[PDB]
Amino acid sequence: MNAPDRFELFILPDDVPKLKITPDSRVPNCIIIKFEREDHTLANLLREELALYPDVTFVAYKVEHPLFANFVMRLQTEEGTRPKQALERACASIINKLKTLDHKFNEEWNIKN
Amino acid sequence: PDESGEYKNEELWALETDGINLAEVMAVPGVDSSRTYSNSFVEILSVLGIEATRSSLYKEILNVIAFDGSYVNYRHMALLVDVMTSRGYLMAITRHGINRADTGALMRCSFEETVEILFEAGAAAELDDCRGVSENVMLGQLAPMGTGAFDVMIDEKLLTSL
Amino acid sequence: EPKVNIINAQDDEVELMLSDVNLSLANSLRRTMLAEVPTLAIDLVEIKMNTSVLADEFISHRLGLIPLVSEDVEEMKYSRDCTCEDYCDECSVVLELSARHEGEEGTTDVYSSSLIKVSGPGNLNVGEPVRRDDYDQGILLCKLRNHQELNIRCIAKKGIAKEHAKWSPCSAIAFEYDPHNKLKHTDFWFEVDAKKEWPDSKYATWEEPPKPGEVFDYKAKPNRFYMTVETTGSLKANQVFSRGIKTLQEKLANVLFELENSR
Amino acid sequence: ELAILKEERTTTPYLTKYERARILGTRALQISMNAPVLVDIEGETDPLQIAMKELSQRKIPLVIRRYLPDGSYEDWGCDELIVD
Amino acid sequence: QKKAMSSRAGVSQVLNRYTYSSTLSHLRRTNTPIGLAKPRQLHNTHW
Amino acid sequence: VPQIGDKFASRHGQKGTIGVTYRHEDMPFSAEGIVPDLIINPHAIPSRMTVAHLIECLLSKVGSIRGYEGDATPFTDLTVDAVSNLLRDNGYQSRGFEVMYNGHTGKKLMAQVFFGPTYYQRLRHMVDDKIHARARGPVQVLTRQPVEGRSRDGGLRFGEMERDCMIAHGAAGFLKERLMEASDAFRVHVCGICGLMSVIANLKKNQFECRSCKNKTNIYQLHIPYAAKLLFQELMAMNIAPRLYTERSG
Amino acid sequence: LNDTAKRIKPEMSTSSHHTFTHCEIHPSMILGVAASIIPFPDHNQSPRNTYQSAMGKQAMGVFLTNYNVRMDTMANILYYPQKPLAKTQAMEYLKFRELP
């Protein structure tokens, strides 16, 4: 009766944006990013990739409610580096790591199977 | 308290007697007549008075409430025992004590014996002042309780001062 | 830097080992292969007639759980993205089932091999139900007595396991790390002795046991994961792994594109 | 006759919770019925918030008529009752 | 029909068909027309 | 289909309802990849002393691993130690504990989790068969109050205890609106002499008249519950005259 | 002996000699139909057994095999009933393994 449609878990409505960014004025160089139609799969990966960066001073994420498919990330870097540049660097690094992993898995499957 | 003033535990011997006979036991020599107590507050009213009856009733209610360790604020039990002993005699919490009050017929009929109370009110030509809460509720008005315990006027002086 | 070591491999399952990767990366890969790898499954059932004892929704739900070959499902288009009305040839696969019992004695068993792929987005290799062997009967669908007939037209579309579990390409993904509890990530419940009361992991011989005189390493991190992926036959295990990696890469690329366009 | 002079009022000078709730509700209803507002409106749109802002600044034009049990009453302005 | 009152009620009940066990339990049911905690206890003779 | 709010119970009196549903990738998983179909709070165990629940779970796990049905007949020689030995002989922990992993992050759980098959049954108490709401609908013919029954689009009852709670809260206006505007409000006319509800009123041509007291001017109108009107009419029918006066004689 | 796992039988040492005239076929037969479904009822609390006996009438399942040809006011049928992994010996006479 009141059950929401399943495809709303991953289909982004046209009137809402996939990504929202709002500056945080409590501490310098800190931003809040609202990810829509996402879950822990991308959030935890991005968080642990950003945590290892020397220029990132704070990174965290939270899912406010399991019934809603979105999460909120807080990211703060040092003075030299803007948080958005760190986020793009993390995304590129994970993409390169996944490409290397796929290449090596394909090589292993070709060598023995 | 001792000679130094510090409170210390002292053990004494008292009697616990089955059955109730207040005046005769109080008159017995060798008995502290200023401290004899009974668990039947009716006998206390018959012998001691009404204030002693209120004290004994509060003591009994407190014992019943706090035997199992529960705690209830003193003001509620004080209000209950004041209501029970407000007319100079014990007012039982039942139709034999509540319905005998001089309150309105509408609020009395709502508890028990509705038709009998209504017939008695019709025969006795009683008048209801509509000051209680029950007859205000059944008539669909603002009861004189809480936010309805006053009236709100208009401040002409402050509006003029603008 | 990441390394992959394959211990066992077969078309139904792969037991492999990852190293020099973060724990979140392995967990995200497992989650993506579990829920975010697109496959092809029946999502629309048209019942022309059904005289069997099974209910219509019962048979429809049974048909929706039948795995189908989704080798070329990546080239297929989503129903929402398709601009055609209802469904067309390049966004769905049409299957036909017609079963009837011949004779007044015995019971006719209707399996999943009776489905016929009448039409689909040719010449893509999708739609055909998965068969274990060339002579495998398949998944038992229903049973029919005399004068009982089944006539079903099914529509198969492309979807992911998030919408419904019937599009899941894999059954169960075994995943573990640190068989000897060197990192002390867990505390072992015990009555007398913790070492004796707890069975050894199947990968305990792969890692050296901790010495009794060893001191705790506070700077150690999980760096060796053992994971076994089992599929339902819709996709090969290597295909599932590669497509999960590709899906994760596409999600990250979409996030990067959104970040770039946000300026 | 039944009124009590201002210099002879014995009731508490504080605003009770019931009086506060009644004044807030009445002021919110009046504001919702297009009544003049004695305070500035910056961003708030809820009439209850406007009434609360008026109460904080002690500008509500209402008078509480507290009724004694005998029948006499005391009139207290909303601008002279202490609000916690 | 004339003497609706002063007669035992609930002697015959609609059979329960929620499950087999419930049906058996309903078919093996006894009741006492007493409508005092003395008869409600589990006596030793009930073994 | 089961959803949030559906009632499920075990064979030991451990009834409950679904609070939330998690997908396959969100549920905790063991090293073998098995995810539970149901998660229950441990806090329900020690209060009710349902040791039989845990014993049944252990026996079911042993029987599922070995491939038969366990015997749970009371007053037998079967003990927990024998079942624990059987479970230990099958390569599992003797007490049924298993090392589980968090679904969100993949990290090991610090505390091991009791994990095993258990018989559960679905009860005939579904949330979709109990949800009810009403703004305005049919009313009773006699009292002009909302009808009773979820199917008949009925109204919830504001009993005497709710009235007592509202009196304690001090919210007189809410109680008045709940018992008048959300219920059988009605308008009646009374005469300023007899006080009785015998005033004949014609609002189309604006004529108010009282036959008994020959009155046409000193007539008032009141807003009262329809049940109050019915009570007053019944009292009049029983040769009782309740007169409603809007002024205090003193 | 001194077994720490099995339960302890009563001593029954108040009589030097015992002369039994009858023997119980099985103590578990003292239970009813609904109480025979509970696995290990002797390890539970009696209010829990009463609660389970009461709520056993609310579970749904295959009450009869001819539900397709019957016209009942209400009927609830589970798609995939399963026989319990832990069972009592009385269930064989209650047809629970055949209509779970």
Place this chain on the structure above:
Amino acid sequence: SALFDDIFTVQTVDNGRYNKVSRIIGISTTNSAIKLTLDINNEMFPVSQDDSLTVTLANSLSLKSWRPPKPTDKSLADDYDYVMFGTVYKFEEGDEDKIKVYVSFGGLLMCLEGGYKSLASLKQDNLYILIRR
């Protein structure tokens, strides 16, 4: 730079009911009547009976939001092995020179007993304790 510094010989090590926290009781070698009891982490800093620990109590590590330290900069903590930070919650000025200082490091308690001439500078709101061996 350092408010207090001394060398303590460990007398008693009590694991208690904790698998990670040990309470150590010792006295200063160079002067008696100075007793140190302190809760420490077993895995982070495993100590045994009859050890010798150089203990330094300071106010700042310089030579508000916490951030991970870069490898480039240096602090006093580079010269020690175990570093903890905590709040002083009691400065008991008892009879004669017997003075006790109570410091809580996130729930790990430490009590230092000594004289005024040695513990007069420890009367602060926050403290850093550094142990080297």
Place this chain on the structure above:
Amino acid sequence: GNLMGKRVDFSARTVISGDPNLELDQVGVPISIAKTLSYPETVTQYNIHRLTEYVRNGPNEHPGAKYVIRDNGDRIDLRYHKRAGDIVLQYGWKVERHLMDDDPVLFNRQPSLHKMSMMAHRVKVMPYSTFRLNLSVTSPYNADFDGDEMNLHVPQSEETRAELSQLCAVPLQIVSPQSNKPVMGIVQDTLCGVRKMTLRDTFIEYEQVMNMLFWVPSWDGVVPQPAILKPKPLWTGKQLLSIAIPSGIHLQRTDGGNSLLSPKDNGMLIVDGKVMFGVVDKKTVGSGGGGLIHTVMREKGPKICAELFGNIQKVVNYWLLHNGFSIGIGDAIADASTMKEITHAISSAKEQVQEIIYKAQHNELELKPGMTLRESFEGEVSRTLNDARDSAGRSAEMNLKDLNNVKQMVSAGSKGSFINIAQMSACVGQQMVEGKRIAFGFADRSLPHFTKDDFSPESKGFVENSYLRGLTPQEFFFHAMAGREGLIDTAVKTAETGYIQRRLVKALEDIMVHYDGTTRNSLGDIIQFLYGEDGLDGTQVERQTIDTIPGSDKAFHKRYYVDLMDEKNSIKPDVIEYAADILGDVELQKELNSEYEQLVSDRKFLREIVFVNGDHNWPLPVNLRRIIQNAQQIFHLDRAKASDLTIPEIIHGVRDLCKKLFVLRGENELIKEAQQNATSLFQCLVRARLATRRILEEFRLNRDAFEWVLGTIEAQFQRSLVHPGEMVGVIAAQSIGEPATQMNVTLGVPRLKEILNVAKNIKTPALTVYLDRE
């Protein structure tokens, strides 16, 4: 059925469910219920655009509207109006919009035993068909999630919306007047979680600390310094929990006379919102009085208390999510040595019972006074068996390890108790029916499997086995008999309790506190000349001690008396800046003498009249210790700075403060006498706390601190008075009837009914006779 109670419109009812991600005063409302229910909002210039958008959305889409009411009262149905996309609203119209977020609604569970069973919540529209509730509001509602149905009512006017928001709001109902203690607390998993969180050996890595800090809604964005810096940063759970606690909160509690070392990590010390030491459990974050919740409420406000509830719940829930907790069968299994000890104790008890039987059968048992020989023998046997069960349970509890899950639950206080562990692991115990052992239902025997005249424990309802070991058929039958008796007793008790509660409510229905301070009924008859004899609300009193009553005379003289003529007995020179011009003064000495005489008079009045038994801890308003410590923290009274507060200033300030605690206002002599009688006890407490020697030496206040304390005391006493118009009669009736549901002379519900009915015949009449001292 139609006037006192009736069926009402704009109401909903559905099954409830739990939700950790909701605030204390928030309720989750399904989409269908929010769409069906509606609220009429007027059309003004402040909400014209929103109302037009809601109308354009229609009744089938949320947010939307159902009806549009014109100025004259005509109604337009948006369901049948298919051209609603080009309709304009006029000022003064009413739009029946859907239930939106942050809408106050009454929320109720039946039966409604007290005022906390019906509270105002804020609507949050959520999917699925169950009401969502915070876990901390289940206890006041007395609800669980096994199929409970609860009701919701929607106000339809601005005045009633304001009444619900300002009177019946959930945060305002945290503290109840029944026992001046909170009724909402941290319960269930969260409680257990914090017990596993604030342990001394709990450490958190940096990334988890960042996640938990971000999970705090009220976090200030500043990362606290870790407890350990080298060789790896580490945060303890105490710091993470203290993050949720607001600053400025001070709390102190001792457990078993523990010292500041706290070797067992018991007690509790919270300074400025940071936990110095102490494991947080039910004793701290529970519903008990004087705990963290009560202190935070009385210090900050209901809004901050609800924020604390939410913050603690979120942090502990995340930590338990990423840590894990479980229970198993192995938690109910003891080792061989403990089982041997339990069996030995049971065998020894059985031998003692056999010895008692032998003594009784030979006329050797001592006869108890006023009891039959059989009754004395039964009492002896029952006492021996109960002692055996208690000893076995104590041994089983002592055997339990720290990692045991049942022991963890018991220590946390979330669930379980000693008796549960004893019955699960050691021994079920003796089964009792109607206060005695199992009677001989058959011919001189309980069961046909025993011989005649058998008095052994196993033949009369003793279950020597545990639940883990199983039960013999005889023990099973006896346990079933006991359980049936308990169920019957509960069933018969509930109806009597309900009838008693209804009678009490009807008796005290029309009692209100008026504006003159009196307590009168509907007739105007005065019941009490002052409510509670002090004119104070039930929620504004806390247990405080009066320091004048206890102690010896020498201790009283040392603590309070000040002698300026003698150097030794005078004020210490190092704490006051005026130590030069204070020796030998006559006016200051006279003032101190007058203060000491007032203190002595207060001591005499308290000891000889009010409290003759020497009790000193009583409920009083205005916590003075909290005020003193708050002033000390605010004004930074450390560093042993010499106070610039003269003795006459202290004396005159205390004297002026004692005369400004106004309860009744007026110049009538009776009014002054009533004011003095009402404020006597509070004046005694204030004079005990604010003594010249105590201020100058123990507390070390200055002029600013003293003035702040006086002002705070006056303001808090003014705020602690009872508000006129309060329906005290119904509150008292509910507060008396509520414990009755939970619960050799007659006691319990029969005794309460006997008292209330005023029975002329007493079931167990008795007299207590006191003799002379000699």
Place this chain on the structure above:
Amino acid sequence: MIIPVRCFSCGKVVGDKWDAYLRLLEEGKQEGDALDELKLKRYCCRRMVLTHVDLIEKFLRYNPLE
């Protein structure tokens, strides 16, 4: 009713092993041995196959409705 297509817990296909399980049970193989020979490792699939009751035959015993 009839054997489920997929395991409820993990999702392994078990709907095609009913005939093989019955054939193995017919030739005297034990239930555990038959389950092992069906390559069912996790006990979720083991209880899916072992505890299934075949009620389809009872419904088929009735005469067709049309």
